[PDB]
């Protein structure tokens, strides 16, 4: 296993957002041309094993552990009725105090806040990616496609990401092989070498959230200078076309930086190799 390995994301210009927004309220539009300097991106979401190395080294107590609760999806035992604040849910206990990560060491770490993610990435000699870096990386060298791999959800009849199949939120058929999370190295990589950049766990980025974007061309944009929520990208194992079509690279959502949930993790980026 090399679950902290990074890949080189090449310098380029790309179209961020879309002029065919699917969730207009989220500021998916307008499409805008963005230039990104070469940098490195983690191939994988940060796993439980990798986060444990951080905690072993630093003693870091996550925000969920200090608050004493975190959000858990009802189906696997609030923003929606299916999100419950569960006492004692945290990265080591993803569904509550009598769940464990011992059988899922290579799954993405969950119940990590934006602050927890920044602590980890900086400890590792890295940083969070910006939303633009994240989206560029997600798109994997393709232009104006829905998904990292193109426009078909199941190219060649194959599952390419861990999302929901069935009737959400009542029945997840596990058709794609995973009801909850999958190992961080599951499913094919995209054109840049990245795994589970859509689906599996949501991923924090460094940007403050806004829905107001200009069509002006930008270089290495960092998002707005202020805000209340940070941007998360990529969707999770919970997403479905019928409710929550958020497993597209252009999709975007937010949470307060001290938030945590059982479908939200992260990966790191770096200017140079650590
Ligand atoms: C985090 O630290 C724990 C505690 O030291 C590690 O677990 C121990 O590892 C030693 C050395 O391999 C084993 O002999 C013990 O059986 C383990 N003890 C316990 C309490 O589990 C753990 O391996 C470290 N985690 C990572 C990812 O490096
Ligand atoms: Ca699934
Ligand atoms: Ca993901």
Curated annotation (Swiss-Prot):
User: Which residues lie in coiled coils?
Assistant: none
Identify the tissues in which this protein is expressed.
Ubiquitous. Highly expressed in kidney, pancreas and liver. Detected at lower levels in leukocytes, lung, placenta, small intestine, skeletal muscle and heart.
Q: Mutating residue 70 to P leads to what result?
A: In MSD; loss of enzyme activity
> Mutating residue 182 to V: what's the consequence?
In MSD; loss of activity; decreases its specific enzyme activity to about 23%; does not affect localization of the protein in the endoplasmic reticulum of MSD fibroblasts; protein stability is decreased
Glycan attachment points: 56
Alphabetical GO CC annotations of the entry are: endoplasmic reticulum; endoplasmic reticulum lumen; membrane
Pathway linked to the protein: Protein modification; sulfatase oxidation
One example of a Gene Ontology biological process annotation: glycosphingolipid catabolic process
Q: How does the cofactor bind to this protein, according to its record?
A: The catalytic copper is required to activate oxygen and catalyze oxidative C-H activation.
Keywords on record: Calcium, Copper, Disease variant, Disulfide bond, Endoplasmic reticulum, Glycoprotein, Ichthyosis, Leukodystrophy, Metachromatic leukodystrophy, Metal-binding, Mucopolysaccharidosis, Oxidoreductase, Signal
The subcellular localization recorded is: Endoplasmic reticulum lumen
Give the consequence of mutating residue 127 to W: In MSD; loss of activity
User: What effect on the protein does mutating residue 239 to S have, as reported in its record?
Assistant: Loss of activity
Q: Which portions of the sequence form the region Interaction with sulfatases?
A: 244-263
Specify which residues bind Ca(2+) 1 according to the UniProt entry for this protein.
162-163, 176, 178
Question: Please, which domain of life does this record's source organism belong to?
Answer: Eukaryota
Q: What is its EC number?
A: 1.8.3.7
Q: What result follows from mutating residue 240 to A?
A: Reduces activity 5-fold
List cystine links. Answer: 121-268, 138-249
User: Which amino acid positions bind Cu(2+), per UniProt?
Assistant: 239, 244
Report further notes.
Answer: The resulting 3-oxoalanine in the substrate protein is called C(alpha)-formylglycine by many authors. It should not be confused with N-formylglycine.
Family membership, please give it.
Belongs to the sulfatase-modifying factor family.
Q: What does this protein do?
A: Oxidase that catalyzes the conversion of cysteine to 3-oxoalanine on target proteins, using molecular oxygen and an unidentified reducing agent. 3-oxoalanine modification, which is also named formylglycine (fGly), occurs in the maturation of arylsulfatases and some alkaline phosphatases that use the hydrated form of 3-oxoalanine as a catalytic nucleophile. Known substrates include GALNS, ARSA, STS and ARSE.
Q: Which medical condition is this protein associated with? A: Multiple sulfatase deficiency: A clinically and biochemically heterogeneous disorder caused by the simultaneous impairment of all sulfatases, due to defective post-translational modification and activation. It combines features of individual sulfatase deficiencies such as metachromatic leukodystrophy, mucopolysaccharidosis, chondrodysplasia punctata, hydrocephalus, ichthyosis, neurologic deterioration and developmental delay.
Its recorded name reads Formylglycine-generating enzyme
